[PDB]
Amino acid sequence: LGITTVLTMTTINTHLRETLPKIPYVKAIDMYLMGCFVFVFLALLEYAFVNYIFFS
Amino acid sequence: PQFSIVEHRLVSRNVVFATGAYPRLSLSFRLKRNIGYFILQTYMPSILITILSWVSFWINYDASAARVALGITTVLTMTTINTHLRETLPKIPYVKAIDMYLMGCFVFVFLALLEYAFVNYIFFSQELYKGRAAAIDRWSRIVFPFTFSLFNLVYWLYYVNS
Amino acid sequence: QVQLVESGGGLVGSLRLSCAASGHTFNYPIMGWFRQAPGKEREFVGAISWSGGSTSYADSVKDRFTISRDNAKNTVYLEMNNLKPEDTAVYYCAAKGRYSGGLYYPTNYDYWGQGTQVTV
Numbered sequence: 001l002g003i004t005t006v007l008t009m010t011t012i013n014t015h016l017r018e019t020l021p022k023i024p025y026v027k028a029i030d031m032y033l034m035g036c037f038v039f040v041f042l043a044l045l046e047y048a049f050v051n052y053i054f055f056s
Numbered sequence: 057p058q059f060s061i062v063e064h065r066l067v068s069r070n071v072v073f074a075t076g077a078y079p080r081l082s083l084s085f086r087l088k089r090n091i092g093y094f095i096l097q098t099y100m101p102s103i104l105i106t107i108l109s110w111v112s113f114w115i116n117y118d119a120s121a122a123r124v125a126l127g128i129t130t131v132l133t134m135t136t137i138n139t140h141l142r143e144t145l146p147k148i149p150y151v152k153a154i155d156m157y158l159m160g161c162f163v164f165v166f167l168a169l170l171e172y173a174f175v176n177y178i179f180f181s182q183e184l185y186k187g188r189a190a191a192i193d194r195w196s197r198i199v200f201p202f203t204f205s206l207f208n209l210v211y212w213l214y215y216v217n218s
Numbered sequence: 219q220v221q222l223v224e225s226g227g228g229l230v231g232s233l234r235l236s237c238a239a240s241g242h243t244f245n246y247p248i249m250g251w252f253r254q255a256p257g258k259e260r261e262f263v264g265a266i267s268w269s270g271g272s273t274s275y276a277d278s279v280k281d282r283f284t285i286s287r288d289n290a291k292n293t294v295y296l297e298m299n300n301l302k303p304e305d306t307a308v309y310y311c312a313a314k315g316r317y318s319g320g321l322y323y324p325t326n327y328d329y330w331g332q333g334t335q336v337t338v
């Protein structure tokens with residue numbers, strides 16, 4: 001479930017890559033999507049250590 | 057957006073053809089690309105997917121389904137990242153800088169699944185059946201991040217500095 | 219609109235002038251420096267472009283002065299290296315619209331700073 005959401009967040013980025021000019025600077029939407037990604041990414045690191053601590 | 061003009065230069069020449077010598081004037085621009093777009097869009101996602109691989113070594117070694125799912129997902133996503141980009145630019149027959157970077161990351165994430173194959177074979181089939189299974193993960197949790205960081209540093213220190 | 223304020227004036231050598239801009243600078247990608255003194259017309263000194271970094275200098279200051287910028291601070295700087303007595307003038311910071319005409323003409327600049335007197 002965790003990795004699947006991680007793939008989905010990147011899937012949004014790969015589309016927003018297309019609709020707009022290839023500008024260098026970070027846009028407001030990019031600041032949001034990467035904000036969501038770190039939440040989705042940390043949600044997987046959460047289990048990564050719950051699994052470790054439990055089975056350790 | 058993509059380029060900043062480092063300089064422009066003016067030239068004058070004569071060019072010779074079979075029908076005579078003709079005057080030429082040339083206007084030139086040195087265009088240097090802005091890397092920020094690619095950092096945000098391509099390189100950083102590749103790094104993040106590579107980091108996502110290292111979660112494998114923290115999952116217990118007997119949860120084979122999860123280990124395999126995460127590793128194969130990482131490999132598949134890296135392959136898709138590789139193949140998507142080359143549609144945006146000419147099908148030129150040589151390896152580019154970003155191609156070398158992505159192939160190195162592919163090597164890392166692929167060895168991060170050959171690693172699970174090794175540990176599973178040692179654990180279920182061939183101290184080996186109890187300790188060596190944990191020892192390989194214990195090595196990897198530092199060896200893979202270390203080696204990948206070294207590769208990243210060397211990549212930038214080649215392409216940017218020389 | 220865009221507001222400009224300058225600093226670094228007064229009697230002098232080497233010196234640096236600075237210009238701070240606020241407001242809708244995106245409509246005004248190019249910042250130019252001008253100077254004037256009694257009994258003479260306003261002179262073009264040099265120019266800088268936001269986010270491009272390109273510069274051009276008047277031959278009277280070419281290879282002496284340089285202009286630089288800080289996009290995050292929205293400040294523009296002119297390095298008054300190797301001043302000479304004839305440089306005495308009030309130095310004005312000004313903004314140029316995207317589709318105004320040539321650089322070298324003050325009439326093409328809309329918003330003007332207060333200007334700093336220098337003495338040499």
Ligand SMILES: *[C@@H]1O[C@H](CO)[C@@H](O[C@@H]2O[C@H](CO)[C@@H](O[C@@H]3O[C@H](CO[C@H]4O[C@H](CO)[C@@H](O)[C@H](O[C@H]5O[C@H](CO)[C@@H](O)[C@H](O)[C@@H]5O)[C@@H]4O)[C@@H](O)[C@H](O[C@H]4O[C@H](CO)[C@@H](O)[C@H](O)[C@@H]4O)[C@@H]3O)[C@H](O)[C@H]2NC(C)=O)[C@H](O)[C@H]1NC(C)=O
Pocket residue numbers: 063064065067068069070082084085086
């Ligand atoms: C993009 O890429 C292009 C292509 O690479 C670049 O274009 C080149 O720019 C350079 C300048 O940076 C040009 O060189 C200048 O060319 C002229 C013309 O020289 C020609 O005509 C002369 C008159 O007939 C003739 O004598 C010359 O031949 C002699 O000199 C050459 C020197 O290279 C020598 O190899 C020959 O054997 C001859 O002895 C030639 O046919 C010229 O005015 C310039 O001379 C200046 O520099 C030389 C340096 O040695 C100096 O001696 C002179 O006193 C003078 O200061 C200079 O050579 C070149 O011609 C361009 N090439 C092409 C193919 O267009 C371009 O610069 C790049 N742009 C950017 C932005 O990067």
